[PDB]
Design an enzyme around this catalytic site. Sequence first.
Site, PDB file in Angstrom:
ATOM      1  N   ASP C  92      29.055  43.497  54.484  1.00 53.32           N
ATOM      2  CA  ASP C  92      28.390  42.600  55.406  1.00 53.32           C
ATOM      3  C   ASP C  92      27.390  43.364  56.273  1.00 53.32           C
ATOM      4  O   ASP C  92      26.319  42.856  56.604  1.00 53.32           O
ATOM      5  CB  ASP C  92      29.430  41.871  56.274  1.00 53.32           C
ATOM      6  CG  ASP C  92      30.259  42.816  57.136  1.00 53.32           C
ATOM      7  OD1 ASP C  92      30.278  44.033  56.849  1.00 53.32           O
ATOM      8  OD2 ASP C  92      30.905  42.339  58.098  1.00 53.32           O
ATOM      9  N   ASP C  95      26.175  50.441  59.529  1.00 58.04           N
ATOM     10  CA  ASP C  95      25.649  51.011  60.757  1.00 58.04           C
ATOM     11  C   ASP C  95      25.811  52.520  60.675  1.00 58.04           C
ATOM     12  O   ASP C  95      24.875  53.217  60.292  1.00 58.04           O
ATOM     13  CB  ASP C  95      26.349  50.429  61.993  1.00 58.04           C
ATOM     14  CG  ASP C  95      27.838  50.229  61.793  1.00 58.04           C
ATOM     15  OD1 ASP C  95      28.420  49.419  62.547  1.00 58.04           O
ATOM     16  OD2 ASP C  95      28.432  50.874  60.899  1.00 58.04           O
ATOM     17  N   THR C  99      32.066  54.716  56.176  1.00 56.10           N
ATOM     18  CA  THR C  99      32.918  54.107  55.160  1.00 56.10           C
ATOM     19  C   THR C  99      32.170  53.910  53.844  1.00 56.10           C
ATOM     20  O   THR C  99      32.642  54.315  52.780  1.00 56.10           O
ATOM     21  CB  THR C  99      33.477  52.746  55.642  1.00 56.10           C
ATOM     22  OG1 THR C  99      34.232  52.940  56.844  1.00 56.10           O
ATOM     23  CG2 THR C  99      34.392  52.135  54.586  1.00 56.10           C
ATOM     24  N   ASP C 151      33.482  39.933  62.978  1.00 56.45           N
ATOM     25  CA  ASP C 151      34.295  39.370  64.046  1.00 56.45           C
ATOM     26  C   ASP C 151      34.119  40.062  65.392  1.00 56.45           C
ATOM     27  O   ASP C 151      33.421  41.066  65.521  1.00 56.45           O
ATOM     28  CB  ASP C 151      35.771  39.476  63.673  1.00 56.45           C
ATOM     29  CG  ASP C 151      36.305  40.893  63.852  1.00 56.45           C
ATOM     30  OD1 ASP C 151      37.270  41.079  64.629  1.00 56.45           O
ATOM     31  OD2 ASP C 151      35.749  41.823  63.224  1.00 56.45           O
TER      32      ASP C 151
END
Lengths: 169, 169, 169, 169
Positions: C92, C95, C99, C151
């Site tokens: 999604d 930045d 990961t 979220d």
Amino acid sequence: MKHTVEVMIPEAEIKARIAELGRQITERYKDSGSDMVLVGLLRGSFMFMADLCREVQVSHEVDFMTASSRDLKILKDLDEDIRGKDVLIVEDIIDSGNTLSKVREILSLREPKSLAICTLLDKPSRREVNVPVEFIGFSIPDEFVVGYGIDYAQRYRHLPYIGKVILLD
Amino acid sequence: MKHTVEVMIPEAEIKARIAELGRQITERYKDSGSDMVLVGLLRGSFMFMADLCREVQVSHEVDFMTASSRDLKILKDLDEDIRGKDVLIVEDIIDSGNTLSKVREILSLREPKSLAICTLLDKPSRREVNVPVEFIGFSIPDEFVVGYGIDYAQRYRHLPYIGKVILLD
Amino acid sequence: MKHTVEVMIPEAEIKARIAELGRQITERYKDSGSDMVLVGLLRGSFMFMADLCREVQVSHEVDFMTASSRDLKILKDLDEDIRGKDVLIVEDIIDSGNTLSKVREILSLREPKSLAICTLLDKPSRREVNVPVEFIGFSIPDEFVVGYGIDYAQRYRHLPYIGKVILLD
Amino acid sequence: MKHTVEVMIPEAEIKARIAELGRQITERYKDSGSDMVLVGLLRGSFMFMADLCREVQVSHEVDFMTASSRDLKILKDLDEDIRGKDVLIVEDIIDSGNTLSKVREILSLREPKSLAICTLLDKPSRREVNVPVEFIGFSIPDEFVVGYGIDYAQRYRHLPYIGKVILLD
Ligand SMILES: O=c1[nH]cnc2c1ncn2[C@@H]1O[C@H](COP(=O)(O)O)[C@@H](O)[C@H]1O
Ligand SMILES: O=c1[nH]cnc2c1ncn2[C@@H]1O[C@H](COP(=O)(O)O)[C@@H](O)[C@H]1O
């Protein structure tokens, strides 16, 4: 966090109690006739499971599982099925009894022939959720223990004996 | 294994049905007041989840869980705690009802405030176990469906519509 | 933590950019001839994956994986193999790039025909580890965004648009 | 499938060999100074791990990992971080070297201070991939071994010795 560890339960004694637990577990199951599987909780039960299963004189499987010690979740489930089999959950120690309690419920749903728990250590005083525990190696007060699978700051997990952490000042 | 895929439920039809499901689920939980969480069962329901949660007009969280289907094992547990929460299990298809029946039992143990199930497709003619299903997108005949998340030999999940494999054609 | 959310990128715009990404992804792979598999990172990519894969006009598989966003670990690995296939990691947002960077390495070891990354959002300024990112939906400043899988306090994950969290005082 | 099990390596022989392995591993890491962690590969190596770590006279942590064996997937990742640490992968048996070779690559990515492997049994005659193995308990002929954690159709892991299945006898 400055401290030292002293021997509380010598490995020679641990070995003796396990051999006896083994006889007890063997006697209790030898005539079932169904498949048996010892289920150890990771990381804690690896060492205890190792010794214990060798003392169990009935043909059995050895599977592991790892839960999250608010909701008890399953990080790694069993690799094999337990339905219709005799299942003996193996843990290094039970205190609050929360995880053990929930894990027993989860496995219960799979309809095993039977379910029992075997812990090396038991801290009765810390119990928060009553759950059956058929086999116990030692009953101890709420002592700061380590070794035999139990750690302290990712340490002492490999000790061959149960020691008590003396918290130096 | 030679086969054809025919449309069974066009994309627009699904889109409309989901909007409805959205209204219904919204109406049902709008006045609850406790946290709410939709739990999709990977892999097959990721698409239905994506579209459904966008039609749910009540603040909620989205989590996933993946389960086997002999014993029902948890290959990937939730990241969230559902205790004291309204939980809406999101599934792509229910036929026999075995897996869902079990997944529901497992979550029930965590004591959520409420527990319901919402499936996109339903093959009642395939039911082997009685399992409560609060919301259904479509009750369909016993066809081997694919698309919209569902697959056929790791194929067709990306189809925007529910299709039916024909085979030997 | 008192706040409000305002629309930053309308869902109608998100839908348009995705359709275009789809054409781009399709064009880039349509002639490979090898198996393709979109790999989404959970939880974040579920919605984006849903829409994106529908815009990809080449036959492909859809698998998910979930890593721990110090060491990047694998909480849930792919269900299928990728060796010799074209793999497009779907996230999604990127930045720091940590990961994504590690996940690309892990999958690399499985020797896929090829590896690429497609993110809905990109925050160039926050990059900490340079990693290739072949397809991006939007380039944004370091804004406090939510929705479409992203979220904030287990909230807004189901929003059909990307919004910015206005932190009321 | 009809078979017999004969002793291949008696329990005492294993016990002695492990004590030696313990001295050797201890000597090797006693002056390192950074944290150390033994990573056993479930399920087969839990027993060897239990005994080996007790012979390792250097403060370490114990963790486990379970991997598949076409693509090598992580079914259960470590709970610990190995970056900047001496890591000793604990395996029960190495024959082809495929799985270990890969598991090693995966951990290597996390940049540990050092990475080595210690296996109880070794079937060089079965090697298909060159993989560095720093410590070996026993190099054995191509026999189908069981016991001491190893199994045969989910059976025999509890044996305190390494045995060889005979079959059709
Ligand atoms: O037509 C089909 N094609 C492929 N998989 C299916 C089909 N119908 C059901 N399934 C699988 O069965 C599961 C539902 O089973 P239930 O909950 O036991 O009824 C779904 O999650 C699917 O993974
Ligand atoms: O004799 C055997 N019986 C059963 N499983 C075996 C035997 N030899 C090797 N294995 C499996 O193969 C793995 C080692 O593979 P490697 O690392 O690819 O050489 C072990 O972890 C075992 O699970």
